[PDB]
């Protein structure tokens, strides 16, 4: 395989501090440099820093230099990343590669840190009901607008996962308000409408919400 063991962070209110861990084996700990790499979703990779295996000399990035501190623990054999004074811009996935020379060979699975003022909300599921005032065309388009919730994620099924073909559940979009929203559509033969029932199955584990919205074909 070739992995390490990260275990910190989650949803964190802004301005507040946070701290991640990166557990490494006794030899790995006293035999290599541990780089903490950053990656904001949809963008490349930012190197945050390193720490020599003998003493733990830390080398940061002058950006993160200002508010991120890398430490470790001999007894526990774990590296650290102190993230004080959090901004929303800190919403990213953190790794802790391990390696020889200036190489990032062994990467950890990564920990996701989500900075947001937003409270836990259940989704509002609306119908994306097929218009009868439309063209025959051939197929149709069912759907459920799962709007205003926090935090991710949601499990959208269609007819208890019996209908699985032609189902496009789009990526959650972060609205200005700070709440997500995504759609789960499934095109079907316009004739199948009426005859076969179509019910989406929304599931939001965080707010323990689970809702089954049946969508009716409606021109109006």
């Amino acid at each position: 395989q070739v992995q390490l063991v990260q275990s910190g962070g989650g949803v964190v209110q802004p301005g507040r501090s946070l701290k991640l861990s990166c557990l490494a084996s006794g030899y790995i700990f006293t035999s290599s440099w541990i780089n903490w790499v950053k990656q904001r979703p949809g963008r490349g990779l930012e190197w945050i820093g390193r720490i020599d295996p003998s003493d733990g000399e830390v080398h940061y990035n002058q950006d993160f230099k200002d508010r991120f501190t890398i430490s470790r623990d001999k007894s526990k054999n774990t590296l650290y990343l102190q993230m004080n004074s959090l901004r929303p811009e800190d919403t990213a996935v953190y790794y802790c590669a391990r390696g020889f020379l200036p190489w990032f060979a062994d990467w950890g699975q990564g920990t996701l840190v989500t900075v947001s003022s937003a409270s836990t909300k259940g989704p509002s599921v609306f119908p994306l009901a097929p218009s009868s005032k439309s063209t025959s065309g051939g197929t149709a388009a069912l759907g459920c607008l799962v709007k205003d919730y926090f935090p991710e994620p949601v499990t959208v099924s269609w007819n208890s996962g019996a209908l699985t073909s032609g189902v496009h559940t789009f990526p959650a979009v972060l609205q200005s308000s700070g709440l997500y929203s995504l759609s789960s559509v499934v095109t079907v033969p316009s004739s199948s409408l009426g005859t076969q029932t179509y019910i989406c199955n929304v599931n939001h584990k965080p707010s323990n919400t689970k809702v089954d919205k049946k969508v009716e074909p409606k021109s109006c």
Binding site: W47, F104, K133, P171
Partner: protein, 214 residues
């Protein structure tokens, strides 16, 4: 400091092809550029360290070359696995910088989108808000545009969209685009239109309705 840059950004390719990503260093390193391969929802893995030195297990298709400021990863024959996102990253000067990233995508024929414009459900209208959804369907390539026009007034800055990732079967993308507004304004207009452009469409596809009529 040492800005690293990749190209092409995206890359249409199919099983059996000879792919080639081009990295560029604004500075001079020697052979301190590595290539990584991270797939969606996954941590990057090293392919080539040194400049040409392949890492353990990395199949003999991945090959590295170049030195100084111009580097290049080469895949001698594309496989199912090889469809992912590749990065480069100098480890010569402090700090260590990585390339923007090049995505490899399964190539197929041009397919135009099947548009569907959903009008607000009467229950969300109670909520005060009214989301008008426009679904571009099973198109290829990604490059497609959506233009919302309320009362023939081209809208701007009042919508959001999310694209789907390569279909495991169709190799076709799917795009949703929502026009979001309160109901006072939804109730203040009549015609809502989703003009859709894609390079696979002979003319722009317009879908619309009339707040009220049916």
């Amino acid at each position: 400091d040492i800005q690293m840059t990749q190209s092409p950004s995206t890359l249409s390719a199919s099983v059996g092809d000879r792919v080639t990503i081009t990295c560029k260093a604004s500075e001079n390193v020697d052979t301190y550029v590595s290539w990584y391969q991270q797939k969606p929802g996954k941590a990057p893995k090293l392919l080539i360290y040194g400049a040409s030195n392949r890492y353990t297990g990395v199949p003999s298709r991945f090959s590295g070359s170049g030195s100084g400021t111009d580097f290049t990863l080469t895949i001698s024959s594309l496989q199912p696995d090889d469809f992912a996102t590749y990065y480069c990253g100098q480890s010569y000067n402090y700090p260590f910088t990585f390339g923007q990233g090049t995505k490899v995508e399964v190539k197929r024929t041009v397919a135009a989108p099947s548009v569907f414009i959903f009008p607000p459900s009467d229950e969300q209208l109670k909520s005060g808000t009214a989301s008008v959804v426009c679904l571009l369907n099973n198109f290829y390539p990604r490059e497609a545009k959506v233009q919302w026009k309320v009362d023939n007034a081209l809208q701007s800055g009042n919508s959001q969209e999310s694209v789907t990732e390569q279909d495991s079967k169709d190799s076709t993308y799917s795009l949703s685009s929502t026009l979001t507004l309160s109901k006072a304004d939804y109730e203040k207009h009549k015609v809502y239109a989703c003009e859709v452009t894609h390079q696979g469409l002979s003319s722009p596809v317009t879908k619309s309705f009339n707040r009220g009529e049916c």
